[PDB]
Amino acid sequence: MEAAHSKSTEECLAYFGVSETTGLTPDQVKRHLEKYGHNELPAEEGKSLWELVIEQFEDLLVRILLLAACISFVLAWFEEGEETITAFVEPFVILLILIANAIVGVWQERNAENAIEALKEYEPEMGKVYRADRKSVQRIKARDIVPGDIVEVAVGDKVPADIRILSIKSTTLRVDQSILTGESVSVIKHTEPVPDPRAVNQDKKNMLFSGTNIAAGKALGIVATTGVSTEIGKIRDQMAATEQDKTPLQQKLDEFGEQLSKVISLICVAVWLINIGHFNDPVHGGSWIRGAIYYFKIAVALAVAAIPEGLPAVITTCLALGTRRMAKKNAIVRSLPSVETLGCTSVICSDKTGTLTTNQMSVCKMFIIDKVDGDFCSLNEFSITGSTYAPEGEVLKNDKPIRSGQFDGLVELATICALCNDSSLDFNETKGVYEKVGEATETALTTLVEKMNVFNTEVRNLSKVERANACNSVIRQLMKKEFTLEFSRDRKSMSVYCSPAKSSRAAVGNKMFVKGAPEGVIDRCNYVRVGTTRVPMTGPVKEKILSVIKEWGTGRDTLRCLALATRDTPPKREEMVLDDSSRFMEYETDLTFVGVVGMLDPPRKEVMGSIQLCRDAGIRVIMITGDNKGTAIAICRRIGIFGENEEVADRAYTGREFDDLPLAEQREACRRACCFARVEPSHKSKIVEYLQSYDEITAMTGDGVNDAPALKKAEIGIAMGSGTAVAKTASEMVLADDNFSTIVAAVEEGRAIYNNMKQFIRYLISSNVGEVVCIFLTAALGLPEALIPVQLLWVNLVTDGLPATALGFNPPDLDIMDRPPRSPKEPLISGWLFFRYMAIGGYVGAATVGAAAWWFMYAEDGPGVTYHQLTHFMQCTEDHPHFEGLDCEIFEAPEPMTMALSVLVTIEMCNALNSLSENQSLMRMPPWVNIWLLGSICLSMSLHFLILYVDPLPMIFKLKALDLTQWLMVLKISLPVIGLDEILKFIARNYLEG
Please state whether beta strands 162-168 and 733-734 pair in parallel, antiparallel, or not at all (unpaired): unpaired
Q: Annotation-wise, does 560 bind a ligand?
A: yes
Q: Annotation-wise, does 192 bind a ligand?
A: no
- Strands in 207-208's sheet, in edge-to-edge order, are 138-140, 127-130, 150-152, 219-225, 162-168, 207-208
Angstrom CA distances, 822 to 49, 344, 612, stand at 27, 9, 13
Q: Where are the domains of the chain?
A: 1-54+121-242, 55-120+243-345+746-994, 346-358+603-745, 359-602
* One CATH from 3.40.50.1000, 1.20.1560.10, 3.40.50.170, 3.40.50.970 for 346-358+603-745: 3.40.50.1000
CB 704 within 8 A of CB 719: no
Q: Annotation-wise, does 800 bind a ligand?
A: yes
Q: In angstroms, rounded to a whole number, what is the distance separating the alpha carbons of residues 675 and 650?
A: 9
Angstrom CA distances, 611 to 530, 547, 620, 743, stand at 43, 30, 8, 8
- How big is the chain, counted in residues? 994
- Count each helix (H run) and each strand (E run) in the chain, helices first: 36, 31
Q: What is the largest CA-CA distance in the chain?
A: 127
b/e burial code for range 269-278 (CB count within 10 A of at least 16 → b): eebbeebeeb
Q: Annotation-wise, does 307 bind a ligand?
A: yes
CB 738 within 8 A of CB 351: no
CB 772 within 8 A of CB 725: no
809 φψ region: left (φ > 0), alpha (ψ -120 to 50), beta (else): left
Among 201, 384, 327, 421, residue whose Cα is nearest residue 741: 327
Among 249, 433, 440, residue whose Cα is nearest residue 345: 249
Q: Annotation-wise, does 771 bind a ligand?
A: yes
Q: In angstroms, rounded to a whole number, what is the distance separating the alpha carbons of residues 152 and 154?
A: 6
Q: Annotation-wise, does 456 bind a ligand?
A: no
Which positions are annotated as active-site residues?
351
Q: Annotation-wise, does 796 bind a ligand?
A: yes
Burial of 608 (0-12, 13-18, 19+ CB in 10 A): middle
Q: Annotation-wise, does 290 bind a ligand?
A: no
Phi, psi of 908 (to 5 degrees): -60, -40
CB 916 within 8 A of CB 759: yes
Under 8 Å CB-to-CB from 344, ≥6 apart: which residues? Answer: 248, 249, 251, 252, 697, 750, 753, 754, 757, 822
Q: Annotation-wise, does 815 bind a ligand?
A: no
Q: What angle do CA 156, 161, 166 make, to 5 degrees?
A: 75
State whether residue 262 is helix, strand or coil. helix
Q: Annotation-wise, does 502 bind a ligand?
A: no
**In this structure, CATH architecture of domain 359-602:** 3-Layer(aba) Sandwich (3.40)
**Cα torsion 73, 77, 82, 85: sign:** negative
Q: Annotation-wise, does 908 bind a ligand?
A: yes
CB 809 within 8 A of CB 752: no
CB 151 within 8 A of CB 163: yes
In what helix (H) or strand (E) does residue 702 lie, and over which residues does it extend? strand 700-702
Among 766, 968, 977, 769, residue whose Cα is nearest residue 850: 968
Peptide bond into 606 cis (omega under 30): yes
Q: In angstroms, rounded to a whole number, what is the distance separating the alpha carbons of residues 88 and 93?
A: 9
- DSSP conformational letter for 853: I
Phi, psi of 209 (to 5 degrees): -135, -145
* One CATH from 3.90.79.10, 1.10.150.530, 3.30.70.260, 2.70.150.10 for 1-54+121-242: 2.70.150.10
Q: Annotation-wise, does 751 bind a ligand?
A: no
Read off the amino acid at residue 588. Answer: E
CB 449 within 8 A of CB 407: no
Read off the amino acid at residue 780. Answer: A
End-to-end Cα distance, the chain:
67
CB 491 within 8 A of CB 455: no
Q: According to the 3-state scheme, what is the secondary structure of 568-635? A: CCCCCCCCCCCCCHHHHHHHCCCEEEEEEEEECCCCCCCCCHHHHHCCCCCCEEEEEECCCHHHHHHH
Q: In angstroms, rounded to a whole number, what is the distance separating the alpha carbons of residues 225 and 38?
A: 9
Burial of 136 (0-12, 13-18, 19+ CB in 10 A): exposed
Fold designation for 55-120+243-345+746-994: Calcium-transporting ATPase, transmembrane domain (1.20.1110)
Burial of 625 (0-12, 13-18, 19+ CB in 10 A): buried
Read off the amino acid at residue 909. Answer: M
In what helix (H) or strand (E) does residue 512 lie, and over which residues does it extend? strand 511-516
Read off the amino acid at residue 252. Answer: K
Q: Annotation-wise, does 728 bind a ligand?
A: no
